[PDB]
Amino acid sequence: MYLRITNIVESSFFTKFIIYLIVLNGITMGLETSKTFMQSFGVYTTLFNQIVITIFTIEIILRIYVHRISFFKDPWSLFDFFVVAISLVPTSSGFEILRVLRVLRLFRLVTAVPQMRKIVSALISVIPGMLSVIALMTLFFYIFAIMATQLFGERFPEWFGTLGESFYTLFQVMTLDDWSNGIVRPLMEVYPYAYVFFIPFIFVVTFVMINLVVAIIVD
Amino acid sequence: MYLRITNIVESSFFTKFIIYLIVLNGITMGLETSKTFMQSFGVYTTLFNQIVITIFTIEIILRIYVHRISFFKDPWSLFDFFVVAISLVPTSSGFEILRVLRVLRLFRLVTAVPQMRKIVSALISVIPGMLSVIALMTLFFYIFAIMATQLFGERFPEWFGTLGESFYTLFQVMTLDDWSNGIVRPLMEVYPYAYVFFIPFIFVVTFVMINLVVAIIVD
Amino acid sequence: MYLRITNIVESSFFTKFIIYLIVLNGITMGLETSKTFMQSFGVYTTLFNQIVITIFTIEIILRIYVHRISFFKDPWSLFDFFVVAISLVPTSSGFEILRVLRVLRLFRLVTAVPQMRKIVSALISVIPGMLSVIALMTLFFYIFAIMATQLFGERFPEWFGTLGESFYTLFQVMTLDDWSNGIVRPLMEVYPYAYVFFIPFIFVVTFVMINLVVAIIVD
Amino acid sequence: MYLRITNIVESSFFTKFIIYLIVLNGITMGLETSKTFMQSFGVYTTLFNQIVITIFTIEIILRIYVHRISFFKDPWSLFDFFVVAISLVPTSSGFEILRVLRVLRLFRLVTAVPQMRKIVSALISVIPGMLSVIALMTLFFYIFAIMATQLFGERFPEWFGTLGESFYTLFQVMTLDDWSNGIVRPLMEVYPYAYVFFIPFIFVVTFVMINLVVAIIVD
């Protein structure tokens, strides 16, 4: 029984089938975007969705019987679990958002194709080295976001009225997004010396990123 | 017949004649852009076109006889075939997009010069190693265009009205084009939490891009 | 039992005491941004800031006693003195900019945690190898800013009327921020050839920046 | 007189002296940017400019005698020659673009200082390596520019009415500057399929750009 189940879930037919179902669901979720299609052929999909969600639900249960505690030492499987989880909460209730969170289950195609799994892992493996530059930068943002609120948040509350608001504008500036005509020239019309805050800020923020890239390559 | 024609195609005069013609057709094509020129000389160059494409048609036929089945195993020759045949489609009124695709024949400069082919081939060469990331990106992109159409498409039809639209808008944001004042600040006036979609989205698309380039460097 | 004090300053508890203070003071200045907070607890929060500022002043005196002249060849300590000093001038009749400057002491978190210290040390270390190119470029901007003031400052004073203005603007075009529809297309309405100035400038400035990054990594 | 003169121009006193004239003129030329200064100090420095041009002219004449055939095979001196020639153009002639071009002479500071020379020399050495790509890139822009004018020029003449405009605009899209909301989206109000030109256009130009840099690094 234990061996009989185990032999099913690991077969090359179970995985091709589920993957096939993933590929199919993802095609329907695209289709669900057309309100035309919804009108003429969407009660079909509402049930198709619940059919696919169960087969996947079974898959998760089976894999937990087979792998037992080692299922939950698999970051990919926890992900699989958690992704199917949020897809279990009802259409109604909570908030409209959980309904939209359901689309995250297409990320199972990543979980289930070894080629996707390898790219993702390789990418993740870049992260641990960065946790030093990241923390410093987050602090850097925090201090400046504070200076930006007090300086500019009274006359420019949309941009700087709040720490959070100061954080959003500074990120925007960081991505260098319409930073001059859109933010600093207006600021400079009240506060002519605002360029002393943002030009240095940009240097730092551009230096750190470049140097972040050097160290990635070398490491 | 065989050896006489075969002797003309491989000649240094042949390829030189063709190449020189490409440069001429290219100077000439810049001229068909000014309708000042077109009212005073257009008949001269509309047929200069016509005789160039005749020569190219002939040359293509000859190279096929000389190279037989090995012609269509040659990517550059394959290219010339398609790049010439297109320019053979009638200017006649039924479908006038094809008229503009004719300028692509200037890409034969690439085909016929060995220093450029090196570059192109070199460029394409980095692609097969990237295909996995292309897929991953597109799967990421696809999930998010879905999320965007259902989240923002109601109140902001232009930007998220349609899966295709959200794809478009999302492409812009990765490129970092007028993304904040131009898209999410408006989004945030109706939906204050849009930054929880687009700010992670920005970290991700950027993370992958950088790592892709590093992947390019190392590979 | 001569120095007596020296044994306390060098201890694990002293340092951990300052870091715990900064992070509290760092958390405090955040909450000082909430306008609601400054009503409910504004008086409470002023007492905490003043204690810490005293403690820190004490902490600086002790470190001077111990290190003597070796304190003032430590950039990190030099930074600590002037940053603590800043937060101490009277709010009275001065410049009210100094009230905002006192957030700079949150950069002491960097100064007192060697990991951050090493990051800041690593970053600075890319600067001396770069100083040459910084000098060429600064020389490049300075020369073109002059050119831009003379060429476009009559009819476009907001952007180029003054040398600093030509600098700020020129810097913006360099960051490529909103430069065609935002700067050059306007200019070009009065002065049709302005692309011969700005387009080359962009090539140059981007080429250098790109080769600068390249030259650092390879070497 | 020649051999006697040659002993003069190679001395360390000489180089630093002409360098000192550059830096002084470089300072004064900054000053010529101010309306105020020019009002109450203009003739002192209008005079001082003519002196320097003469000295540089004499300096150029001397070095010719010293170097003979070699002078006109020195890249740094050819620059030196012509940028002095510009300043030798008379204060008039109806093309005051040249009056502005005077400040091109401050670049002699680059030719006269070997570390500057070294950076410039280092930078240029990158270029012959890229001549294949620039030709390729310029060929690519040339082709798509043609397509633009015939595709979008009649309804959008400012942006695409003509080759240069298409060139300009295309150059603009390649710096990714306001490309979407500013150019492609408007186009789409009238030409719904414009994303098929510009999005491929962007991918390719980045690809070539990115890959170019990677080639430089490894080599």
Ligand SMILES: COCCOC(=O)C1=C(C)NC(C)=C(C(=O)OC(C)C)[C@H]1c1cccc([N+](=O)[O-])c1
């Ligand atoms: C004619 O009188 C004004 C001259 O002032 C300047 O040349 C500046 C120098 C000296 N230092 C910098 C760093 C500046 C500068 O412009 O730097 C930018 C690159 C950040 C400018 C400046 C000085 C005051 C105000 C502005 N402004 O509002 O554009 C610009």
Ligand SMILES: [Ca+2]
């Ligand atoms: Ca912009």
Ligand SMILES: [Ca+2]
């Ligand atoms: Ca932009």
